[PDB]
Amino acid sequence: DLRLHLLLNTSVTCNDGSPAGYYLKESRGSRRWLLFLEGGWYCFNRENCDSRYDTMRRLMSSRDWPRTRTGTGILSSQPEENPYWWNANMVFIPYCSSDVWSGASSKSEKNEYAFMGALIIQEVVRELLGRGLSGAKVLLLAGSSAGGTGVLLNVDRVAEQLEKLGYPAIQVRGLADSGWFLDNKQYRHTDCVDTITCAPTEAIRRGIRYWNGVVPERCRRQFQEGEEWNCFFGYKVYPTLRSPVFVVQWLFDEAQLTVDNVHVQEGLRLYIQNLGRELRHTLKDVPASFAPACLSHEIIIRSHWTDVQVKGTSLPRALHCWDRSLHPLKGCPVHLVDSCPWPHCNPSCPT
Ligand SMILES: *[C@@H]1O[C@H](CO)[C@@H](O)[C@H](O)[C@H]1NC(C)=O
Ligand SMILES: O=c1[nH]nc([N+](=O)[O-])c(Cl)c1Cl
Known part of the structure; x- marks a missing residue:
């Protein structure tokens, strides 16, 4: 389990002005730190943020957060579930700013909501330095969905x-x-x-x-x-980025298809094939990437994240190869993009 810490600087808040926070499991002796950004879409005006506050309140407030969370997938401390970084210091940063981690605005007489995602990340980092992060060798900022965009x-x-x-x-x-x-x-x-x-x-x-x-x-x-x-x-x-970034992206991501209004005849077949080809094209010059030809919404904190492979290599392996590359490597690839053109042409896709 990871334990909740609400931010000591209570001016750094979730949407409703409650304190933001982070869940932490320390690993004494490890100088690796994994800081994971949760996802969950966003809201962009008063009316749609109000709706989100009614039925997605944990994404807008810390008032109902539990004291602990279980680390899963890349946040698991069990080597069986997390071959990559099971011994790391683990940090889960809940997404409660609805701003794709980009905001720098407080709640005020002119603002019903605070959008502080960019400041939340900075404040978590600052408070962690006093809890062992000052001794780190590597800080991996990871995230899924809106949290993945937040990493970028x-x-x-x-x-x-x-x-x-x-x-x-x-x-x-x-x-x-x-x-x-x-x-x-x-x-x-x-x-x-x-x-x-x-x-x-x-x-x-x-x-x-x-x-x-x-x-x-x-x-x-x-x-x-x-x-x-x-x-x-x-x-x-x-x-434009200077820090090394590893990109994980399904070629047929369900959120992409949703915003594209795809919910099979020739027109839709060509549309889907073109989407996968365009995604593959954008990754051509991304040297650390893992892009399976699957239709999925599944994420790297899921417990079975080890199962999918591209060209015979799993994501935990590719991430380990990336670590080695940052010290090409014989049998330890880091650029893994499927070339087959239709969802589930990779047999290891999530079921
Ligand atoms: C608290 O956070 C705000 C917003 O990021 C910042 O302006 C202020 O300096 C912080 N205060 C302390 C004591 O860290
Ligand atoms: O969380 C998200 N999910 N999907 C999309 N998309 O456009 O497909 C975006 Cl931009 C975000 Cl921020």
């Missing part, structure tokens, strides 16, 4: 924070799972008139304004004012 948006800022605080020996790296999206044409189209009909580019453009969202500096300087939404798309922000 925040890994270089964590690296900069530690450098400025006087810890240049901690190697900051990113692991972005299921957060690599395409700003593509939908299979069926709707103008952004309400929440359902609004495509992610427009929802994110509105969200950045509502959240006071921040993006990595080099990407911000490329796209400039009004266009920072571009930095939420992996293939555009990744080339």
Whole structure:
């Protein structure tokens, strides 16, 4: 189990002003630290945030969080379940800011909600330094879904924070799972008139304004004012990053298909095949990646994350090979992208 710590700086809050926090399981003697960002979509105006507060309140508030959580998948401390980093110091950071981990805005007389995702990450890192992180050799910032996008948006800022605080020996790296999206044409189209009909580019453009969202500096300087939404798309922000980042992405991610309005005749067959080909293309120059040809919403904190393989290599193995590469390697690959063109053409896909 990982134990809850609410942030000592209570000005760093979830959406409703309750303190943010993190769950921690220390591993004495290990100098590896895994900080995992939870996912769970986002909200981008008062009305859709209000709805989320009614039925997804744990994603907007710490008031009902449990005292402990069980670490699973890459957060498991059992080598049987986590061949990669079972002995690491484990940190699960709940997603309670609804801002893809990008926000820097407090609740105030002008703001019904606080959007502090970027500040939550910084505050967790700061408070962990007093709990052993100061001795770390590697800090892996990992995350799934909106948390995977959050890794891309925040890994270089964590690296900069530690450098400025006087810890240049901690190697900051990113692991972005299921957060690599395409700003593509939908299979069926709707103008952004309400929440359902609004495509992610427009929802994110509105969200950045509502959240006071921040993006990595080099990407911000490329796209400039009004266009920072571009930095939420992996293939555009990744080339701007300095920290090593390993990208895990299903070629047919269920969230991508959902925003594309895909719920099989020739038109849809071609659409799906083109989506997989486009995703594969965006990963061509990503040297550390794992992209199986599966239709899935499954994530790296699931207990059976060890089962899927690309070209005969599992993700825990690929991550271990990545660790070795950061000290090509005979029999220890790090670039694993399926080439077959249809979901479940890989037999190891999740059932
Ligand atoms: C608390 O957090 C806020 C927002 O990030 C920051 O401005 C302030 O300096 C922090 N205070 C302390 C004592 O760390
Ligand atoms: O959490 C998410 N899930 N899906 C998407 N998508 O566009 O497919 C996005 Cl942008 C986010 Cl932030």
